[PDB]
Amino acid sequence: KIFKPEELRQALMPTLEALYRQDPESWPFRQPVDPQLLGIPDYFDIVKNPMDLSTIKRKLDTGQYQEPWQYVDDVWLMFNNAWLYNRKTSRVYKFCSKLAEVFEQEIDPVMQSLG
Incomplete structure (x- = not known):
């Protein structure tokens, strides 16, 4: 039903910290x-809705997510933007793929527990 901001932070923040733990990705x-x-210079024409770890962390700490899928949508948006913009052979794209793999492993049991 209703998701309290502290309840969401406690369950979701470990999944975000798992991404930050990836060095150097x-x-x-x-x-x-x-x-x-x-x-x-063409970045903002291609990427209409930018997202990054600091923006997600700020939203999570200030209770801007009502329910867990809003957080998931932002993390996924961050990766999708980078896959959209960067060439598949580029370092950033490869780093994005590693982070996305880490995230799916983290997020499935959390969304199962939440729900």
Whole structure:
């Protein structure tokens, strides 16, 4: 039914910390992509709804998720953006795939317990 913000943080934050624990794969996901710094001027035309680990962490800590699938949607959006934008052979794409594999392993038992 209703999901309290502390209840959601306690169940979901370990799955986010598992992504942060990936060294070095989490590095290009820690801050919002800056197309100027990264020299990728077309980024915001292709990626209409950016997402990254810091934005997700801030939302989770401030109770911005009403139910667990809103959190899942944001994590999935972060990976889908990076797969959309980056070439399949690029380092960032490969890092994205590793994080996405880690996340699915983390998220399934949490969504089973929650529900």
